[PDB]
Amino acid sequence: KIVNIGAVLSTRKHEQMFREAVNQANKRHGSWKIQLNATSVTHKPNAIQMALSVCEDLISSQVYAILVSHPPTPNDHFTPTPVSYTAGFYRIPVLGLTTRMSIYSDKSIHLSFLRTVPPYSHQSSVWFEMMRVYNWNHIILLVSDDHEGRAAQKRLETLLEERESKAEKVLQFDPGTKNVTALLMEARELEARVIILSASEDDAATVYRAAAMLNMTGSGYVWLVGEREISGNALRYAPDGIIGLQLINGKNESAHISDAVGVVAQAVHELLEKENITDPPRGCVGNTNIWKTGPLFKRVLMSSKYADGVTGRVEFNEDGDRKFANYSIMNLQNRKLVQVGIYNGTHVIPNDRKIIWPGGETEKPRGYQMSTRLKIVTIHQEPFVYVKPTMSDGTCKEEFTVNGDPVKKVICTGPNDTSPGSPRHTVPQCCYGFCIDLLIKLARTMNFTYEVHLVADGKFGTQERVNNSNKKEWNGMMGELLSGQADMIVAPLTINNERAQYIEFSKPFKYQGLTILVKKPEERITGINDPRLRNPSDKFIYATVKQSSVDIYFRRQVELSTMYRHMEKHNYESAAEAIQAVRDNKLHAFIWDSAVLEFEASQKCDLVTTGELFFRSGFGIGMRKDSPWKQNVSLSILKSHENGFMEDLDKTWVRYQE
């Protein structure tokens, strides 16, 4: 007829308040014959013998609830873990009250741990409420604590599942280092300014000093931190105008103890109304039998619904967290904490105080500034991308064409040869041609600067297994684009269904098919329907560029596996290698696009194309995902389609013959 409650509490005044709450718990519950005893223990500066003393004292006491209520501990470990593990050996609920670590959220590790405080990842949902208010989509994540970093990434993907957007940059590294400013500058070069930080006080002060020295706290830079990042020297190193969070009664222990007493008391009076009552045995000596109503009492604690307390509607979810939590939103106005918002369990309301930002006006700074210098990457296409070495030092010889058109070149940067050939030789040379004039037309239509560089290899990019952990990766232009080093691929991109699933496409500027390059008895082949090419031999030598989209289009064709097995022994690096090889009469056929070989037939009369025209497709501009550089650029491309500028580009290279 007795119920024992164990507690690890230090101060005698709060012990007296705890005993007073135990005494007042039996007030409104009638004259029932249940009794409530409480046993509180102090704290030795160690942790092993503390765990020993507490575990054998609570075995000898046979308690039902175990409480740890020590915020101001000098050790920064904050580990009530061993007593919770010892109670989880017999499945006894330990109600943690102080810490908010995400390692306690794992119920597979902490089998019988409950708590009335949520982890900080739920604050990101509050920050998602910022996304419900300030209408901001692209974020920049920075988490140093990797024990909670996977849970923060999980919660972030759970929040972004609704809008189906993507985080622009995520970062995880070892806490303790200092040279993280390179990734800060890489995030600075991005369009967004939203900064989400999840670390301890030392790394927060380190990144505050790094943003202060590099002036990343100017206009438009969105800063959004929590309670751990506004304490200690991080509060001293914080810039003025930063927005932070505050836990209402997060450190106020006296009402929190009474709330915990009310929760435990109503849980015990709920459990007394049901059958199958079991008791914890004397597990110190000769008792390893588990307490059989562990998950039963846990299920009692799952449906615990309350209506008493100064905090309010305390309620457990499936994770045993805190529902309907009042939060405060603070601002740092001239090294002074100024309250600028309140938060109920679903909605943010700013108070009568104004919101003064570190940048300009008091309204929200739209920190989504698009890149005025679009990084352009391309492959060396032979009739389209002419690359010429410089004359004296980084210069371009301004030669004139035969039609009175001056060639407007650009200073591009490119490697010299392949990686076994050239170890490291990347020089700036002169790029011009077809798509360069297309980019000149785009820069004439819309005012934006650019940065033309070249892809490191001579491949488009295929979907290949990386050599560890069985993961798909891309390479080439797609590998340089998806890594964030490139912005817009201006190249004759072969449009297919696989790449449409991953990135968005624009309107095609080129429209052509496929053809066969031969040299001039049947000297022609007339397409794929030659039966000798269905079952080839060592005579008809035909191949294509290694890691090309033509090979992917043939890989989708499940009825031409013989050509896929035949052409893999003769794939070359570039198409010019195939031109030189068939120039020496070593090749016999080559599947390639139409107008390139038409221009090369206009250059060299021995180069002969075939008669058929299959795979009538289009080539456009390689693009990113949903972006404001899509609609206006596509309208500019269609404006180039409707006028005679396509005919002008034909007059430059296509219509011009010899």
Partner: protein, 499 residues
Amino acid sequence: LNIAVLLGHSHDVTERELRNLWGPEQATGLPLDVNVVALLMNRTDPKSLITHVCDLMSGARIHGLVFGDDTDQEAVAQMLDFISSQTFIPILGIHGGASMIMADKDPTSTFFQFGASIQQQATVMLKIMQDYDWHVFSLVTTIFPGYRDFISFIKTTVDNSFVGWDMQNVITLDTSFEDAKTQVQLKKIHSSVILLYCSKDEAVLILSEARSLGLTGYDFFWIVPSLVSGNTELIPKEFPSGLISVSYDDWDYSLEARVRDGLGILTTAASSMLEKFSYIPEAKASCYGQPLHTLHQFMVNVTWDGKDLSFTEEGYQVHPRLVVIVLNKDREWEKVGKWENQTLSLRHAVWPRYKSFSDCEPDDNHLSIVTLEEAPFVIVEDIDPLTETCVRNTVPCRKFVKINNSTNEGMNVKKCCKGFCIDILKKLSRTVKFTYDLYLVTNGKHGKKVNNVWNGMIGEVVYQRAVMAVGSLTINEERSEVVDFSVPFVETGISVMVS
């Protein structure tokens, strides 16, 4: 150095074989003072754990702790992880609750387990699903913890595999099922392979609802992990006979060989760390009272006697020993397959049916089909080494290739097939919508009677080891006497080839 091996066991495992585990072991002894302390504990409370750690850590500064468990308590490994975090001593978990998989370790703790995590187990199970072309499947996740990591690992593995998995959406749970809202999500299921991540007491109710909703058919599959499959003795009758499980519990390797390998890893790490730094033995004196050179990130490179016993970044083994088991008709966890370094071995490459999961299951829909290797009809090629998967139009089959003429033992090598009769059989499977059992014959050619004994496909069909012959076969009088041919579809006579 000084290593203590304490064992908590219920089975009569004596101590003197651990005393004999010191003499011939470590013949090339690079530490000049290697000593072992073998102890046996009868109780499994953490008070005895703290007591024996304070005894042996003060017991002439023992730097190695080895523990095995016989019970079903996963909190003992967490207690030993806390002990390794406090005392800074490398502690190894061998068997039972000392080898149960935990989620995330700490840099302050140097505790390690000899086991197989749920991520590598999910990799092995998806390798099984890739090797069987079971691409249309589902996923049911309960409120058992450690589940969002499992879903995310499945999502990344599907996004990083050459299959392109046809995955049905995840059936999620909130509490114990009301059979009102979970009923709608369970009635969305129409696929065969069903994956599940829960506890055993939840799985009893899940399988009871699945039998109540008829999800235990011959087509429907059930693959469960090792954490839900507990004791080998405690098997309730609600389990379907044919339940696929993957557990690293190998009965061929005893606990003594595993702790011998653990001592080999400890002496290897000590000998390799002594060659780099001098003052290697550094421990804590006693528990009562108020480190730089550690073995926490040092023994990733380790190999004992050729066994690839290397360690991961998370603290588990790189290449463990996974065991694929099923549940037979005799209600026993039947040992079936073992796992290699990275590739998977299959002792039973022929996938068994277990078509009668219960008593009242009248089902006769499978069809045994055999064919013969002919070039314009059945092109028989190897599996693609880049994908380890037969392409869309090719179908897998087996071939029992013998090793020699000395023994009759062989291997069922799986190969891909295409051609004419493969397309005919695929279109028959499209029209009739049945289930087929395709394999190859190893007796020889079409058929020839040698003293009332037929051979090849005639010997397979007439003696009723198969159902029908879809492949190419000539028709004459006695073949039409022994079986019943269908109508002819192709006009194939005989001819003579000349110049």
